Amino acid sequence: KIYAEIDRLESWKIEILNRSIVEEMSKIKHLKMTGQTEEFFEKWREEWDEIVTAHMPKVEELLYDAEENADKYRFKKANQVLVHIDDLLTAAESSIEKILREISDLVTSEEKSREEIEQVRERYSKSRKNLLAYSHLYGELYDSLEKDLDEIWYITARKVLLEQDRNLERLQSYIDDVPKLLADCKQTVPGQIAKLKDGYGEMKEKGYKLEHIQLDKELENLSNQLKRAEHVLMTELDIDEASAILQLIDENIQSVYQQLEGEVEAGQSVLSKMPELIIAYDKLKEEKEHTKAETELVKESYRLTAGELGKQQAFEKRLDEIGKLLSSVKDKLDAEHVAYSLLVEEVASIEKQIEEVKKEHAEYRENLQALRKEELQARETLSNLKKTISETARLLKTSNIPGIPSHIQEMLENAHHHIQETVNQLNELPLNMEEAGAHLKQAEDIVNRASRESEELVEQVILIEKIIQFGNRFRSQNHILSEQLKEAERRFYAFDYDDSYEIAAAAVEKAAPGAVEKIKAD
């Protein structure tokens, strides 16, 4: 039922709003009028309102709801129709209102922009007034520009203005940058070409044919880039690409400069790598070390033996080799054609070649000097081994059973048979430390590993003696077992007495391995 009221509402609304806006066509915003674009809408506004004076009385006709007051089903079927119609009209109205609130906008706005546009064309006449470099295209541009501005004198005109903005932007985007642009194709293009060719002209005191291929070619690339830049600018193309080309060129140039400074470096490095050949004679003191190698005649004659007199001569071989590499390097260097830079890789090796050999001859200096000390610590070791052997030899008393019956005439017949070797050592004149060291590796762990076992045997004998010394003859089955130990020990067997005192631990307290072993450890 209330739908009827809503129907009145969206009728009063549309009618009053349309009355107002149609009333607001001649009595408002009437200022400005183009006799072309306006006469289009001066008909569109008519027919658009001619619609609503036909499509609203259709709604008036369709007020059958007044009669259809008996049903509620046929109601909405002839109601939503109408409401959607009203929506269809008022959606076609606000479209118009937006149309006009643009035409009145797209005039009054652009009417305030032509001021700035003319203001800019006043500052482009001036900026080309005083100019003759590159002022052939500028004339054409200014000309067409002012032709356009002369043409603008509605919406089409707005568009033309909006064109002229961008056009102006391009005009001073030109007039600003182009000054410096040509200014490099006159004093900064040959300004660098001259500096580089005269560069080579100077670098004719430090340059080779090896670089007569990858050197003079980059100028053949540059001399292209320049003409490419020119063909860019002088043709309708603009700062874009060309301003990049200048960068590319600059990169090329300074790359070349770096390449030159690197050979200045290679030239300067030699002056610190060929006074290293001054030390190449300071290490030619072979005949000063081979005189130090004439104290073989007085002592340590193993210098004259292998693995010692050798190696040094091999370092004389190495010194000959590097000595030849030097002459080859200088020979290659001192040519009628100038020197260059590929030499650096050929000397970095040589610095190492001396760095090593020097340390080698140093090592052999040390080796020679050490021998005089080697036959001292050796004398210490032997003079000690004698003491050890003595004391253990005397320790081999008191133990009523002759120790290691098999290993007695074995590890003691190495006491005499590895001292007569030392007789041969410190009696030799000149002696040799190899003959000494050999009969010392054969002296180590053959004196000790014969004293350890012996001391363990003495310990064992004293122990067992003090064990049976607590032999308890008062027992009947322990005594007769104890007798089976004496008869076993007085032979020549080291296990015969092992299970011996194990019996003496299986009839005596748990502290049997501590009964005697403690008293002994006192």
UniProtKB/Swiss-Prot annotation:
Gene that produces this protein: ezrA
Question: How is this protein named in the record?
Answer: Septation ring formation regulator EzrA
Effect of gene disruption? Suppresses temperature-sensitive mutation in FtsZ, in a wild-type FtsZ background increases the number and alters the position of FtsZ rings. In minimal medium cells elongate and occasionally form minicells. Double dynA-ezrA mutants have longer cells with more double septa than either deletion alone. Mutant is hypersensitive to tetracycline.
Residue ranges annotated as coiled coil are 340-388, 433-460
Gene Ontology CC: membrane raft; plasma membrane; septin ring
Where, in residue ranges, is this chain on the Cytoplasmic side? Answer: 1-522
Write out the GO biological process terms: division septum assembly; positive regulation of cell division; septin ring assembly
The record's family statement is: Belongs to the EzrA family.
What is the annotated localization of this protein?
Answer: Cell membrane; Membrane raft
The record lists the organism as Bacillus subtilis (strain 168)
> What does its PTM field state?
May be degraded by FtsH protease.
Q: Which InterPro entries match?
A: EzrA
| Keywords recorded for this protein, A-Z | Cell cycle, Cell division, Cell membrane, Coiled coil, Membrane, Septation, Transmembrane, Transmembrane helix
Q: What does this protein do?
A: Negative regulator of FtsZ ring formation; modulates the frequency and position of FtsZ ring formation. Inhibits FtsZ ring formation at polar sites. Interacts either with FtsZ or with one of its binding partners to promote depolymerization.
